[PDB]
Paper text:
To generate a second conformation, a copy of the parent protein is rotated around a “pivot helix” and a new backbone conformation is then created by combining the first half of the original protein (domain 1), the second half of the copy (domain 2), and either the helix following the pivot helix from the original protein or the helix preceding the pivot helix from the rotated copy (“peptide”). Using a combination of Rosetta two-state design (see methods section for details) and proteinMPNN(27) with linked residue identities, a single amino acid sequence is generated that is compatible with the state X hinge as well as with the state Y hinge-peptide complex. We solved crystal structures for two designs, cs207 and cs074. For design cs207, crystals were obtained from two separate crystallization screens: one screen for the hinge alone, and one screen for the hinge in complex with the target peptide. In the absence of peptide the experimental structure agrees well with the state X design model, and the structure of the hinge-peptide complex agrees well with the state Y design model. The crystal structures of hinge cs207 in both designed states demonstrate the accuracy with which two very different conformational states of the same protein can now be designed.
Numbering used by the authors:
A (entry chain A): 2 to 173
B (entry chain B): 179 to 203
Write the structure that this text describes.
Amino acid sequence: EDERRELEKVARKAIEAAREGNTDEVREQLQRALEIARESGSEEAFKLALEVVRRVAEVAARAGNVEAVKEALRVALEIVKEAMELIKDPEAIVRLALEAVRVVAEVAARAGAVEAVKVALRVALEIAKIAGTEEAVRLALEVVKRVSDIAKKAGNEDAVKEAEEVRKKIEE
Amino acid sequence: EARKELTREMIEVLREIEEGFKERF
């Protein structure tokens, strides 16, 4: 697929600008990756754009670039809405929604927002309720898995405690 | 306030994703 090798080029350019502090270049490449996924229409392209959003949000947070992180969260919302308009498959919308909810939850665990980590787990449980599929709860447990993992390596004890609770809630 | 803006946008983007999903279903 030639659509994939386009997002990799804009990913190298977006993560490079996230380190040197070129927040304006981050806005351009993130908006470009949105246009790449918007033109094709396939779920894989809408998905592959989320990796770029998650990739730049990691390096921007690791470099103290707070505004570049806020730009990634904005794009993560835009790919979801652009998918709800393009994608006709309701199950593909569920996957892309939890994949975006998972991204905003990993950045909140590093940032130790606690309240945002709680809302992310609260939203992720709600998305899997209307879906009612075994695929939805599998990805919902993955948002809890990533929140608990990232919060441990960060030493934020408030999130690993909330993650273990939400995991036990849907086990029944 | 810069970190408060980061957390505030996280809550908003999350509730917008949930809102758009409850409308399609």
